[PDB]
């Protein structure tokens, strides 16, 4: 019932977009359709092209294009002949004869709009993956884009939480010590596998200390994993929530408790490189949503891949002779999904 | 003289 409208600085080019966020469903992405209002009297001999570009921007300025799609809207190119959506038909009926459609198909295995949080000493552009729909007036495609003729609209590729809840994330580990005949067991679980932004995360921890050693501390932390792959492969770790509990588990004793954690941006604003959801211009966006990949693909994708895990770490006292030689850090990680519910 | 920002319009 309403579409976005942006005009050229000279007013001779107008781009009509029905959305700014296009949902990726893993198997396919929402088509980027629209209508471009042209002025052939002004547009003497030139042509109107519309471009969809996915780019990995600054962060000195290492800007690379991950996916470029280009369509000629005026004059109507027979190559770009696709059936019109209802939105494009309504828009053309509203505008007139000088309204021409464009349609893009975003291929799968492409990054979602993810912004990396700049550091305190950073003063450049926004690092991350961005999408942009650009319409311009040019005689050919080898001519530079002009600021007066072009309209740039930032769009976002988003993913929402899966409708069906996943299996409960449970994990456990066991350690055997030298002087202890029985082992130390740690069990951790989350109340659900898909969480929403701002929703608390409940961590159910079961510790069965059958050893001679005491668990001094239990550290519960939610960490964000950003897989950034442009020139190299690099995974970055960022604890978005923590809970250093002073709970002690006595030897030959068990301990069960439920810890509640909530990741939010207010206390993570000083962490450089922290992944955030895509921004339109500079608005405040939450922590990055988990990216939904194919079930089994073993595929490494250019861009930023965001995942979250809860690490339950046990601190074990060091002593009882035997020359240490023990981990003393009995950690367990539980992967969960941090996303947005599908809008109703 | 500023750059025309994004706005909306009814589809009718």
């Amino acid at each position, epitope marked *: 019932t309403r579409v976005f409208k942006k005009a050229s600085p000279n007013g001779k080019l107008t781009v009509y977009l029905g959305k700014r966020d296009f949902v990726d469903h893993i198997d396919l992405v929402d088509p980027v359709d629209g209508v471009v209002l042209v002025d052939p009297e002004y547009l003497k001999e030139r042509r109107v092209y519309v471009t969809l570009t996915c780019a990995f921007r600054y962060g000195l300025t290492f800007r690379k294009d991950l996916f470029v799609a280009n369509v000629q809207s005026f004059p109507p190119a027979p190559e770009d002949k696709k059936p019109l959506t209802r939105l494009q038909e309504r828009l053309i009926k509203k505008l007139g004869e000088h309204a021409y459609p464009f349609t893009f198909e975003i291929p799968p295995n492409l990054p979602c709009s993810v912004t990396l949080q700049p550091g305190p000493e950073d003063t450049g552009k926004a690092c991350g993956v961005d999408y942009e729909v650009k319409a311009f007036c040019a005689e050919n495609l080898e001519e530079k884009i002009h600021k007066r003729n072009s309209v740039r609209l930032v769009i976002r590729k988003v993913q929402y939480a899966p409708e069906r809840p996943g299996p409960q994330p449970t994990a456990e580990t066991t350690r055997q010590f030298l002087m202890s005949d029985k082992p130390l067991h740690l069990e951790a679980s989350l109340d659900k596998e898909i969480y929403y932004h701002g929703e608390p995360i409940s961590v159910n921890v079961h510790v069965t200390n059958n050893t001679n050693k005491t668990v001094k501390k239990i550290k519960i932390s939610v960490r964000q994993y950003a897989d950034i792959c442009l020139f190299n492969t690099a995974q970055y770790k960022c604890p978005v929530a923590m809970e250093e509990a002073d709970d002690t588990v006595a030897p030959s004793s068990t301990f069960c408790k439920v810890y509640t954690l909530t990741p*939010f941006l*207010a206390n993570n604003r000083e962490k450089r490189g922290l992944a955030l959801d895509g921004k339109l211009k500079h608005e405040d966006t939450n922590l990055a949503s988990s990216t939904l990949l194919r079930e089994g693909a073993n595929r490494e994708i250019l861009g930023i891949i965001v995942s979250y895990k809860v690490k339950v770490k046990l601190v074990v006292s060091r002593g009882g002779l035997l020359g240490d030689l023990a981990s003393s850090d009995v950690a367990v990680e539980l992967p969960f999904t941090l996303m947005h519910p599908k809008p109703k | 003289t500023f750059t025309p920002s994004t706005t909306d319009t009814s589809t009718r």
Partner: antibody, heavy 117, light 106 residues
Framework: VQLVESGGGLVQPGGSLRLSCAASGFNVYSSSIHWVRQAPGKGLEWVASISSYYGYTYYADSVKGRFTISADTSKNTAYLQMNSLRAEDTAVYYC?????????????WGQGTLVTV | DIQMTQSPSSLSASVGDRVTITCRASQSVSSAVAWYQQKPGKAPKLLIYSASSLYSGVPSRFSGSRSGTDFTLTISSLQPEDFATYYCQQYKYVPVTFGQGTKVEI
């Protein structure tokens, strides 16, 4: 899922009060807590908003400096410290809740407490 | 701030009569407009958000529409429980500004 506010009473001009909003049924980080007052016989007027997810607090120009909105995220409760009160600050102060992702109106309201100056 | 001009200040209608309440924004607040009803002595109750989205629970006789900077609240059939004061909110920009209310009587 309901809101309870308490702490309004008769206070001389230049006095101070602390209005508390016992929020229950939702999380402080998935919701935004707002205070909207209403003078007797007048319409609704927004005075203060807090977003615990972003750690941002907003005030109206009339209450800027004098008023302070807080949140005790431990017990899911928000507070409004109305320091340096004035006679024109008498109203029924409502505590309202809005979605953090994303604002779609003040869907839940409290019963309202009268602050008489 | 943004002036949220509402009209009429008050109106009278019968049971089943069609009631239209119009709110006008000084600037372009997009569709970020909400509507409330507040019966005397009770808290305000959300009716429509995004200027057209009916809230979960409120009866279907309430409908919201926009035209540029003109937002309208329409009540198709006026039930006996629909006589209250109706406020228009804009939440596009801080500070949030409400309407002056529209008292609806018999």
């Amino acid at each position: 899922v309901q809101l309870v506010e308490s702490g309004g009473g008769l206070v001389q001009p230049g006095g101070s009060l602390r209005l508390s909003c016992a929020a229950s049924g939702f999380n402080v980080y998935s919701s935004s807590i707002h205070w909207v007052r209403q003078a007797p016989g007048k319409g609704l007027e927004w005075v203060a908003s807090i977003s615990s997810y972003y750690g941002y607090t907003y005030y109206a120009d009339s209450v800027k400096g004098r008023f302070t909105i807080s949140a005790d995220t431990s017990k899911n409760t928000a507070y409004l410290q109305m320091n340096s009160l004035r006679a024109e600050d008498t109203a029924v102060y409502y505590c309202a809740r809005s979605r953090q992702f994303w604002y779609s109106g003040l869907d839940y309201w409290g019963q309202g407490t009268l602050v008489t100056v | 701030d943004i002036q949220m001009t509402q009209s009429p200040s008050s109106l009278s209608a019968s049971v089943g009569d069609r009631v239209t309440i119009t709110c006008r924004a000084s600037q372009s607040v997009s569709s970020a407009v909400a509507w409330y009803q507040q019966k005397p002595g009770k808290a305000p109750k959300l009716l429509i958000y995004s200027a057209s989205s009916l809230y979960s629970g409120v009866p279907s006789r309430f409908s919201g529409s926009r035209s540029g900077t003109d937002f309208t609240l329409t009540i198709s059939s006026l039930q006996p429980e629909d006589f209250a004061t109706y406020y228009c909110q804009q939440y596009k920009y801080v500070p949030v500004t409400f309407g002056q209310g529209t008292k609806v009587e018999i």
